């Protein structure tokens, strides 16, 4: 029980993470891409819940070998991911196939604190298809916040910038009322960067974002 | 016992997150014009920094009439005054008193913008209807990019929140409220939000836009 | 009852002087093998493994180099933040004073080194020898945070961008990750030439506090 100030008059910083920060476990995370293509990538997501706001970072690593083939990245690199911190209760929303979260602070209930707030996103969340073309361009989201960054990668990629667009989402045929988070990444290259999507690009060509920080309202 | 200074995460909130109270928040606009919007602010103080989000809903009928919202963008200014009970003249937008979700009753004073750190990075605002200041005239700002949703023909293409603490001339304190100017842009095919023939229930609604400033 | 061990505590350190009444003793690396002395105040909180900081830089034309044109080139400078400078002075390339702990024990500045695992392939190696400026287009990945500074009346600033990327200096005693930060500040054509010898040396710019976040130790 309480002290000179009660331990729930005090908000507890909670922590969960998803994926593998060592990027030594392959590329088994599903990303949907424009025009009904897809990619498998690697990722690490670190989320803290403090005061009802979620502050997190997302870090994505990809290879051309596990990317689709055809088209031109330089002229066209865009991909969509879903974060489902409550995938244990709602497996069908885990569209990107993240592992279970790993709770570093809080109950086994803690994942539920990282669904996107129900009141404030009621009319700022996209409905997603359950199939492999659930990709939504950021101009189709009902609202988003934008986070600017730049990845690194193989030498001739010649990246010029990057943007992360966060928008909560719901999947058409779920088992719970909860909001997941949709994230579409747009990454650009100068005119002479190598065509990530080309068939004459060796498979070990890679890009790797830093951890990208973002914030949304928690549950 | 050792937690003398274990920093306490304090929480206040402004406005109505259900957006079911009409549009009574006051926003200053270019050319000595105004709008009435709705909004919800959620402010956290941790370790001396305030991490908050703000969400605005607005309708064309509660916006001024005249001009072209595609050539001009949609531009409006808001004042967050978490210390408005002690300093009502500085609540230029007319927000209700904040609600304390975590902390004492003094907690709103934490969300005043740090006195030392904005001494020369704060704007002095008019007490009158055209308090609008364009972000190019702010003595410093941070920028936070977003996009709102809205009615179908709006064709929004981006937004930016510009954050810079502020002060009101005839105020009752030396404290720093927070001034916020929004700029929402549309493509060449978008509805004129400012037209008299635009349906009055045509609306935009930002997501919660996250921002951070140095707290008190 | 509720253990102070089982609950992540908010730790706070700070570097520099938030009053800007101690001069301009901070070393800022600049393009074209040039440099500048500036003033700074960094406020860092560590909350659950992520660092949420702000940085504010004050600079005068007098303590900036001379030569060039600040409207054509922009105003660009890199700093290093080294909260572990006490244990690794080799890494304190900008020469900040030691941090001041506002929340935590004396070992707390180490929690503000950038995450070893998460930045292993996203960290720039800064020159061991001499000037270390790195254009943001040459960092192995960054995060960008847009602002606009104020300054004296003719500067005509049009925008600002802080590019955050952790760094190592190889000759360091530790393997710890400091923070490299390059600032790019833009001016319209009307703007005072910050680099010119005609410019009153007290001509200045002052950024607001710029909020940024990286993964902690
Ligand atoms: N951000 C919030 O206000 C979270 C609300 C919380 N779920 C109650 O109960
Ligand atoms: N961010 C801060 O430094 C807040 C300062 C607070 N008033 C104490 O002292």
Structure description:
3 copies of one chain form a homotrimer. In chain A, strands 1, 2, 3, 4, 6, 9, 12 and 13 form an 8-stranded antiparallel beta sheet that branches. In chain A, strands 5, 7, 8, 10 and 11 form a 5-stranded mixed beta sheet that branches. The first copy, chain A, is 2% helix and 41% strand. In chain A, strand 10 (159-171) and strand 11 form a beta hairpin. The first copy, chain A, is mainly β and 219 residues long. Chains in contact: A-B, A-C, B-C. Strand 8 (144-150) of chain A pairs antiparallel with strand 8 (141-147) of chain B, so a sheet runs across the interface. Bound molecules: glutamine (2 copies). The site of one glutamine has 5 residues of chain A, from loops. It is classed as cell adhesion. The entry lists the keywords avian adenovirus, fiber protein, cell adhesion.
Describe the secondary-structure layout.
3 copies of one chain form a homotrimer.
Chain A: E1 14-19, E2 29-33, E3 37-50, E4 53-63, E5 78-83, E6 102-105, H1 118-121, E7 126-128, E8 144-150, E9 152-153, E10 159-171, E11 180-189, E12 206-208, E13 212-217
Parallel strand pairs in A: 7-10
Antiparallel strand pairs in A: 1-3, 1-6, 2-3, 3-4, 4-12, 4-13, 5-11, 8-10, 9-12, 10-11
The structure holds glutamine (2 copies).
Question: What is the CATH topology of chain A?
Answer: Adenovirus Type 5 Fiber Protein (Receptor Binding Domain)
Number of helices of chain A: 1
> What is the CA-atom radius of gyration of chain A, in angstroms?
18 Å
Give the CA-CA distance, first to last residue of chain A. Answer: 25 Å
Quaternary class: homotrimer
Give the largest interface.
A-C, 33 and 33 residues
Family (chain B): Belongs to the adenoviridae fiber family.
Organism (chain B): Duck adenovirus 1 (DAdV-1)
Subcellular location (chain B): Host nucleus; Virion
Protein name (chain B): Fiber protein
């Amino acid at each position: 029980l309480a002290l000179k100030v009660s331990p729930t008059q005090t908000p507890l910083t909670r922590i969960i993470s998803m994926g593998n920060n060592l990027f030594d476990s392959g590329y088994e995370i599903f990303a949907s891409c424009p025009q009904n293509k897809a990619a498998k990538v690697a990722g690490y997501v670190y989320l803290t819940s403090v005061g009802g706001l979620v502050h997190g970072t997302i870090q994505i690593k990809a290879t051309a070998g596990y990317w689709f083939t055809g088209g031109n990245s330089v002229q066209e690199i865009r991909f969509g991911l879903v974060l489902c911190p409550f995938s244990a209760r709602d497996p069908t929303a885990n569209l990107s196939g993240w592992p279970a979260p790993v709770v570093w602070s809080g109950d086994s209930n803690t994942p539920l604190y990282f669904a996107a707030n129900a009141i404030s996103y009621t009319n700022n969340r996209v409905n997603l298809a359950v199939t492999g073309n659930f990709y939504k361009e950021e101009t189709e989201l009902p609202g988003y916040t934008r986070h600017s960054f730049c990845p690194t990668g193989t030498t001739g990629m010649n990246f010029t910038g990057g943007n992360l667009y966060v928008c909560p989402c719901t999947v058409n045929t779920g088992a719970t009322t909860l909001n997941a988070i949709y994230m579409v990444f747009v990454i650009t290259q100068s005119a002479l960067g190598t065509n990530f999507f080309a068939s004459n690009t060796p498979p070990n060509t890679f890009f790797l974002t830093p951890p990208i920080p973002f914030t949304y309202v928690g549950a």
